[PDB]
RNA sequence: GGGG
């Protein structure tokens, strides 16, 4: 796959807070600094590949991040959070990186999810392809160790929503879907000031043939659950594990599950209507009836 | 900086 103005204030001398590179500073809000670092620090890593400059963020007034009620007091939303961006690199680096950021501020970095479903014989219900990605141990305090997810990752710099959903679908399942068969189904943005770095998420759906070859993760494959012990996990007290043993393929790390099961499994850590809120097809797709979410 |  094919992998208004920002006022930078040059620091004549670097503060010992970080100790012949140049150092530039940008004072802005989390509404904008969210996009220069991106969904998973990935847009920052890409600004690093393209220009070589390193980026670091820090709240300007972290003390306001501890108050509950509202220059002083609690922040109302995560977008009013004051953020200080520091750029480290050559002068041509900060220069080249400066416009890339000025094009990134106008984009909308998001996480993307492609709900892949298949029809069943003797059926009006459908099954969805499910993954279990094991999260890094350097993760915020509200993110569990293992995430039961549908295929999808995040957009790259300059990448549109649906192409990212198509790209990252193949990266985690080896399945190739055509753009004419992907339909947008919704978007969520639920963040709180303390999680000022959270980006929204765009949702899509598509139907694959019932006999489709599910190869599994094609990128970072050891970052997903596979080759588990069938009996060991069958006695786990977590209902998701007990569901993973019964349904998932240990060779690929993928499982086909009904929407009545997904919402039940996701109910503790998400709530009700998990599938219907995210993956309800639009009427023009002739898919609402076959999906069964209405 | 993981939309479970």
Author numbering: 59 to 61, 76 to 91, 95 to 145, 157 to 380
Paste lines from the article.
The 5′ ends are processed by a pyrophosphohydrolase complex termed the PPsome, which is composed of the so-called mitochondrial edited mRNA stability factors 1–3 (MERS1–MERS3). MERS1 was shown to be the factor responsible for catalyzing the 5′ processing event while MERS2 and MERS3 activates its catalysis. Interestingly, the MERS1 Nudix motif (KWTLLYERYKEAAIRTLWEETGI) lacks one of the key metal ion coordinating acidic residues, which in MERS1 is a threonine instead of an acidic residue. The MERS1 structure reveals that it is comprised of two α−β domains.
To address this question and obtain insight into RNA binding by MERS1, we next obtained crystals of MERS1 in complex with an RNA binding site, 5′-GAGAGGGGGGUU-3′, and solved the structure to 2.6 Å resolution. The MERS1–RNA structure contains two MERS1 subunits in the ASU. In the structure, density is evident for four RNA nucleotides bound to each MERS1 subunit. Strikingly, the third nucleotide constructed in the structure, which is the best resolved of the RNA, overlaps the position of the guanine nucleotide in our MERS1–GDP structure. The well-resolved nature of this third guanosine suggests it as the linchpin in RNA binding and supports the notion that the GTP binding site in the MERS1–GTP structure does not represent the location of the bound 5′ nucleotide of its RNA substrate. Of the four bound RNA nucleotides in the MERS1–RNA complex, three have contacts that would provide selectivity for guanine bases and hence they were constructed as guanosines. Comparison of the MERS1–RNA and MERS1–GTP structures revealed that RNA binding induces conformational changes in the RNA binding pocket; Superimposition of the MERS1–GTP and MERS1–RNA structures results in an rmsd of 1.3 Å for corresponding Cα atoms with the significant conformational changes between them found in the RNA binding pocket. Specifically, L2, comprised of residues 222–230, which covers the RNA binding pocket and is unique to MERS1, shifts by ∼3–4 Å to accommodate the RNA. The largest conformational change however occurs within residues 111–128 whereby the helix composed of residues 116–125 shifts as a unit away from the RNA pocket.
